[PDB]
């Protein structure tokens, strides 16, 4: 099994989400530690923004890391993506309420967590990266493009329309400070 010889704790989820996460782990040979225990679990699966963890574990990881491992049939390093460990977000603030964000080169559970962060920070997320606003199509004008690497259809339009194309770390730095981070510090060309 994928998670064979691995023990897990599942914390911070509702009753229904916990069962889905529990069954997913067991279907891949994973072991579930029932608290309280003397077993130091290898992993503690927590929500993206984290939760209270009062038991010593090997690594605290998110549901996004878990689902990414299953989609790729590979035990992915939790340290290879900031979304695989709890994301620090300043609560009570919506610093991106003035933004209209479109994503590119983001697929799967990584995209869903990113869309979760953008909406949690007040932003409006659109599948389209448009020039100007078109009310007749339900589309608003775009303000930011979040891409991983240069090149691509949306990226070439961002340089052409003078709209900021930034890394994912701009979204994460915004979430940590509670203020809209400077796009010039997170441009993709640099």
């Amino acid at each position: 099994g994928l998670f064979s010889q691995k023990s897990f704790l599942v914390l911070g989820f509702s009753v229904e989400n916990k069962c889905n996460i529990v069954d997913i782990i067991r279907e891949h040979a994973g072991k579930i530690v029932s608290l309280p225990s003397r077993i130091v679990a290898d992993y503690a699966v927590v929500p993206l923004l984290g939760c209270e963890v009062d038991v010593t574990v090997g690594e605290v990881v998110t549901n996004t890391w878990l689902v990414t491992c299953i989609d790729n049939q590979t035990l992915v390093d939790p340290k290879s993506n900031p979304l695989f460990t709890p994301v620090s977000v300043m609560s009570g603030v919506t610093p991106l309420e003035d933004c209209v964000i479109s994503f590119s080169q983001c697929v799967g559970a990584e995209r869903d967590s990113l869309v979760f962060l953008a909406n949690h920070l007040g932003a409006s997320v659109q599948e389209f990266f448009v020039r100007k606003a078109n009310a007749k199509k339900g589309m608003l004008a775009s303000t930011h493009l979040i891409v991983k690497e240069p090149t691509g259809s949306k990226y070439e339009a961002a340089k052409k329309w003078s709209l900021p194309a930034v890394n994912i770390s701009w979204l994460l730095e915004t979430a940590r400070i509670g203020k809209r981070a400077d796009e010039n510090h997170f441009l993709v060309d640099n």
């Binding site: 590119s104 599948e127 389209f128 448009v130 020039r131 589309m139 259809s153």
Partner: peptide, 6 residues
């Protein structure tokens, strides 16, 4: 307006 990637 750039369409979304497939």
């Amino acid at each position: 307006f750039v369409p979304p990637s497939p």
